[PDB]
Scaffold this active site. Structure first.
Site, short mmCIF file in Angstrom:
data_model
loop_
_atom_site.label_atom_id
_atom_site.label_comp_id
_atom_site.label_asym_id
_atom_site.label_seq_id
_atom_site.Cartn_x
_atom_site.Cartn_y
_atom_site.Cartn_z
N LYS A 42 1.95 -46.54 53.91
CA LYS A 42 1.63 -47.36 53.33
C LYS A 42 1.18 -47.26 52.16
O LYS A 42 1.42 -48.73 51.57
CB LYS A 42 0.71 -48.10 54.61
N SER A 90 1.42 -43.45 58.90
CA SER A 90 0.75 -44.45 58.05
C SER A 90 0.07 -44.91 56.74
O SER A 90 0.36 -45.06 56.51
CB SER A 90 -0.41 -45.32 59.03
N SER A 118 -5.30 -50.51 58.93
CA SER A 118 -3.70 -50.33 60.08
C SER A 118 -2.60 -50.95 60.31
O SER A 118 -1.89 -50.19 61.35
CB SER A 118 -3.30 -48.56 60.09
C1 LIG Z 1 0.56 -44.87 60.88
O1 LIG Z 1 -0.26 -43.89 61.18
C2 LIG Z 1 0.52 -46.08 62.73
N1 LIG Z 1 0.75 -45.41 63.86
C3 LIG Z 1 0.85 -45.74 64.94
O2 LIG Z 1 1.24 -46.37 65.12
C4 LIG Z 1 1.20 -44.74 66.47
N2 LIG Z 1 2.68 -45.11 66.69
C5 LIG Z 1 0.10 -44.34 66.95
C6 LIG Z 1 -0.90 -43.59 66.83
C7 LIG Z 1 -1.53 -43.88 67.84
C8 LIG Z 1 -1.91 -45.13 68.94
C9 LIG Z 1 -1.35 -46.10 69.03
C10 LIG Z 1 0.01 -46.23 67.53
C11 LIG Z 1 -0.83 -46.88 62.56
N3 LIG Z 1 -1.94 -45.94 61.96
C12 LIG Z 1 -3.20 -45.39 62.94
C13 LIG Z 1 -3.95 -44.33 61.95
O3 LIG Z 1 -4.31 -45.62 61.25
O4 LIG Z 1 -4.98 -43.57 62.42
C14 LIG Z 1 -3.36 -45.86 64.37
C15 LIG Z 1 -3.56 -44.91 65.73
C16 LIG Z 1 -4.27 -47.35 63.96
S1 LIG Z 1 -1.67 -47.31 64.25
#
Ligand SMILES: *C(=O)[C@@H](NC(=O)[C@H](N)c1ccccc1)[C@@H]1N[C@@H](C(=O)O)C(C)(C)S1
Ligand SMILES: *C(=O)[C@@H](NC(=O)[C@H](N)c1ccccc1)[C@@H]1N[C@@H](C(=O)O)C(C)(C)S1
Lengths: 453, 453
Positions: free
Chosen positions: B46, B43, B284
Site C-alpha cells: 500500500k 499490505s 491498513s
Molecule cells: C495487509 O497485509 C492486509 N492483510 C490482510 O488482509 C490479511 N488477509 C489478513 C491477515 C490477518 C488477519 C486478517 C487479514 C491488512 N494488513 C494487516 C496488517 O497491517 O498487519 C492487517 C491484519 C491489519 S489487514
C-alpha cells in the site's frame, strides 16, 4: 558439496532456489542450499500423496461408483429411489457411467418410480483446497476433485473469433454439456489485442459469464473450462442417460449429506491404485492427487473427508514411517495451494523412503523419465547425455515456481536422490509467457554437476 | 553491516527474511540480507499506492457518488430514470447514501416514473485481484473494492450455537441487510467437534449458505461477511431507502455497464485523499487501497480501470519519479494477491523517495507509530525504549507473512529507512493461532541493532 550458489547466478534476478541432494549409496549429502527453507512445492507435493495412498489404501484399492435402492423391482418398475453413489473416482468417463446405468436395463427396470438421490457423502466440506487462487478455479487443470467426477469435470465451448475488430465472438456450448456460457466477448484490433483479457465469472448451476476480448483468429477453436457445481452436472447427465436408455424417470434430484442406506444393484470399479498413481505421477493429474488425498483420509479415519482431514491423515501415515514434517503446511495432495510450505529436506526424506522401500512400494516406475515419458519427455535441461534416459523426476510448476524432485544415477552407478524448488521466478509480468532459458541452463548445469560429483 | 542472518535464528525454522535498511543521513546501506529476493509484501504494498495516489490524484481528490436523470421534474414527479453513479468510494455509509437520496425529496420529487439505473462504468473487469485466495473472499477483510461500496461491502450475522449437540444453530441477520443467510449448521458433541468445519457457500444474489457444524458455543458466534454481488446489494439498499423516504418507485433495476448521461441532481463527496490515505496507512484498509489503485488508473489513463490498468498506472507513475520495478509483480494496490512479488530494495527505494519529498507529499505522518497508533500501537517487538514513539512502519500480514516497512531515528539522531519481509512463517498447522513470540524477539533485536549501528 556442489557449489549450488554459483549455479543460481544463472537463474533470473529475484528468484530463490532451495536445492538438496543425497548420494544414497554413500549416505552423503552432496548439495545443501536453503535445504531447510519452506517453499512452494507445487506438484512435487504429489510424492507425499503417492506414498500415503500406497500405505493406507494398497494396490488393490479401487474407486467405486454404485447404484443402489431401498425399494423393490417388479413389472419393470423400481418401486422407490435410485441412489447413485459417487466416491471421488477421478477417472470416470461418461461412457462408463452410461454402462453402469445400462445395468438397470439389463435387470429389466423399465422405469423408476421414485426420486434420483446422489450419495457423495464420503467427501465432506468444500471440494477445493484452502489457499487455492480464485481466478484459476474455471481452468480445467483446476477442476474440482469432487465425489462426482465425470470426464475430469471439464467441458469445452466452441469459439469463432474470425472477425473484424469490434465484432462479437461466437461461442457455442456443444450439445453434450449441460452448461450455459453467457455474456459477450469482442474481437480486439492488434493495438488493444496485446492487452486482452477474457474474464470468466461463475454463477450458480454451471452458468459462466464471459466478458472481455480476444485477438482475431482465423479458425474456430475450443476453450476448456472446469465444471463448478459437480452435483448438478452429474445429476443432469444421469437424467439424459436414463432417457437415452429408455428408462423412465420423472422424480426430483436430492442431494443428502449422509450415506444412503441401500440394496446394491450394480457397481463400476476404477482402475486400481497402481494405474491411478502412475497416471498421477507421469502426467501430474491434479484431480487424481486430490481424490486419493481425501480417499486416504476417508479410509484411514472411517469418516467423511475434508481437505483438512486429508492433511491430518497423510501426515499421520508418513509420521508412522519416520518422516517428520515440523511445521510444514500440506493443504492439499496436488500442491495447488499457495499456502503449502515444505522444505527441500523434507521432500528428500520421502524420496529416500521411496528408494529404500522400492521392493515393496514400486513407486520408482511412476516417475517421468528424462527424454522418454511423462512431463519431462522434453525438458530442456535434461535432454542430453548423461541426463537423458537417466534422470527420473516429478515436476511441479505454478506461476513463478519450477520444481523437480526424483533420482538419477551418477558416473559411478550410485543412486542420487534430489529436490530442486525454485520460487519467485519472474522474467516479465502477469500474463507474459515465461523465458525458460535460464531454467534450462541452471538445470543442465546442476544435474551434470550431481552426475560428476 | 548488521548480521541479519544470526538474528533470523530466532524466527521459526523454515521462514525466510528479506531485510534491507539505509541510513539516509550517511546514505549508507547498513543491512542487506536477501535484499534482492522477490517476496510477498502483503499490505506494505500500500506504500506504492499512497505515492501513486498523491502524484496522480492529489490532495483535493474525492470520490463522487451522484444522482442524475434525464426526465424533468414535474408536479412532484421525476419523469424518467434515476441514475445513481458509483465511482468506488470505499468509505460510503448507508446513512450517507440515504442523505444523498433525501436530496431528491428536497427538490420536490415524490415519485420516480421510470427505472433505477446504476452507472458503475469507471471500473471494469473483475472487482478482485488475480492471485487472491478463493476461500477468503467471503470475509469482510476481503470485501470487493467495487464501484458500489456501501458500509465497506461487509455485513454482520449471528449464529446462536448455544444449544445441545444435535440441535440446529439459529441464524440471525439484522433486518437492515438485503441479503440471505440460510442452511442447517448443527452443534457437534465433544467427540465429533474437532472434526467439524463451519463452511459458507456463496449463491447468486447475495444468498449465503452455511454448512457444517461446530462445538457448542458459550457466547454468540459472530459472522462478518463480504457482500458478493455489490450492484444488486446497492440497488436493493437504494429501493428500501427510496421507500422509507416516501418516494414512490415501481420501475426496473437496470445495469447497463456503460457511462450514463443525464443532468446532475446531487453529488456526495468522500473525504479527500489525505484523510483516505491516513486511514489506509494507519489502519491498513484493504478496500481504500484497491479503490485508490483503480481510481489512479481511471484518472491517469482516462478509461474504465481494471486491476491490470491499476498495475500499469502505478508502475508508470512511479517509474517517472525514478523507481525501477524490474520484473516485480504488482497485481493489486493492497498486497493481498499471492502472485505479488517484490524485493525489499525496491520498497526501500520508495521509502527513500517518501522521506526525500516529505515537504510536498506529507506521507510521513500517515505511518503507524510504535506504541502510539495504527496497527503497531501494541506490536510487541517495538513497544519498549528506544523503539516506542520512534519506529513508524506500515505493517503487512497474511498467513505465513509478517512484514514492516518504515523509518526510525537511530542513537545519533540520523534517519534510517528499512524494509522487513518475512515469508514462510509457520509455528503450527493452517487453522492454528500463530505463535508470535519468535516474531517479537526477532523484531526487538533487529530494530535495536538498527538503533545502535
Ligand atoms: C495487509 O497485509 C492486509 N492483510 C490482510 O488482509 C490479511 N488477509 C489478513 C491477515 C490477518 C488477519 C486478517 C487479514 C491488512 N494488513 C494487516 C496488517 O497491517 O498487519 C492487517 C491484519 C491489519 S489487514
Ligand atoms: C503441479 O505443479 C500442477 N501445476 C499446475 O496445475 C499449475 N497450476 C499449472 C501450471 C502451468 C500450466 C497449467 C497448470 C501440474 N504439474 C505441472 C508440472 O508437472 O510441471 C503441470 C504444468 C504439468 S500441471
Amino acid at each position: 558439496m556442489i557449489n549450488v550458489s554459483d549455479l543460481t547466478q544463472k537463474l533470473p534476478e529475484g528468484s530463490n532456489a532451495g536445492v538438496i541432494a543425497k548420494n544414497i549409496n554413500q549416505n552423503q549429502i552432496i548439495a545443501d542450499y536453503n535445504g531447510s527453507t519452506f517453499m512452494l512445492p507445487a506438484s512435487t507435493q504429489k510424492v507425499f500423496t503417492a506414498v500415503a495412498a500406497k500405505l493406507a489404501l494398497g494396490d488393490q484399492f479401487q474407486f467405486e461408483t454404485a447404484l443402489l435402492s431401498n425399494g423393490k423391482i417388479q413389472n419393470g418398475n423400481l418401486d422407490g429411489n435410485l441412489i447413485v453413489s459417487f466416491t471421488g473416482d477421478p477417472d470416470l468417463t461418461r461412457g462408463q457411467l452410461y454402462s453402469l446405468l445400462a445395468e438397470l436395463k439389463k435387470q429389466g427396470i423399465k422405469k423408476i418410480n421414485g426420486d434420483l438421490v446422489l450419495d457423495t457423502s464420503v467427501f465432506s466440506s468444500h471440494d477445493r483446497g484452502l489457499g487455492w487462487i480464485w481466478n484459476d478455479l474455471t481452468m480445467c487443470f483446476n477442476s474440482p476433485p469432487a465425489a462426482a467426477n465425470i470426464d475430469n469435470n471439464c467441458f469445452y465451448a466452441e469459439l469463432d473469433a474470425n472477425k473484424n475488430p469490434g465484432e462479437i465472438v461466437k461461442i457455442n456450448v456443444p450439445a453434450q454439456f449441460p452448461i450455459q456460457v453467457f455474456g459477450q466477448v469482442y474481437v480486439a484490433d492488434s493495438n488493444e489485442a496485446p492487452y486482452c483479457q477474457l474474464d470468466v465469472v461463475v454463477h450458480d448451476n454451471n452458468r459462466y459469464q464471459v466478458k472481455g476480448c480476444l485477438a482475431r483468429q482465423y479458425k474456430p477453436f475450443g476453450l476448456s473450462f472446469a465444471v463448478q457445481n459437480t452435483d448438478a452436472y452429474a445429476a443432469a447427465i444421469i437424467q439424459r442417460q436414463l432417457r437415452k436408455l429408455g428408462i423412465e424417470f420423472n422424480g426430483k434430484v436430492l442431494l443428502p449429506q449422509k450415506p444412503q442406506q441401500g440394496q446394491l444393484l450394480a457397481k463400476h470399479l476404477s482402475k486400481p491404485l497402481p494405474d491411478l498413481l502412475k497416471k498421477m505421477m507421469k502426467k501430474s493429474d491434479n484431480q487424481i492427487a486430490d481424490s486419493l488425498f481425501r480417499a486416504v483420509a476417508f479410509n484411514y479415519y472411517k469418516r467423511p473427508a475434508s481437505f483438512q482431514l486429508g492433511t491430518l491423515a497423510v501426515k499421520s501415515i508418513l509420521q508412522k514411517q519416520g518422516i517428520r514434517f515440523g511445521n510444514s503446511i500440506l493443504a492439499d495432495g496436488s500442491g495447488l495451494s499457495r499456502h503449502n510450505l515444505v522444505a527441500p529436506k523434507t521432500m528428500l526424506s520421502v524420496l529416500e523412503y521411496i528408494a529404500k522401500n522400492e521392493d515393496k512400494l514400486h513407486l520408482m516406475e511412476t516417475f517421468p523419465i528424462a527424454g522418454v515419458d511423462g512431463t519431462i519427455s522434453g525438458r530442456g535441461g535434461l535432454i542430453s547425455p548423461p541426463l537423458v534416459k537417466n534422470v527420473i523426476a516429478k515436476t511441479g510448476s505454478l506461476k513463478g515456481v519450477y520444481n523437480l524432485a526424483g533420482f538419477m544415477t551418477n558416473a559411478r552407478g550410485e543412486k542420487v536422490a534430489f529436490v530442486q524448488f525454485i520460487n519467485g521466478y519472474s522474467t516479465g509480468d502477469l500474463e507474459s509467457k515465461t523465458k525458460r532459458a535460464p531454467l534450462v541452463q541452471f538445470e543442465r548445469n546442476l544435474y551434470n554437476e550431481l552426475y560428476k560429483y
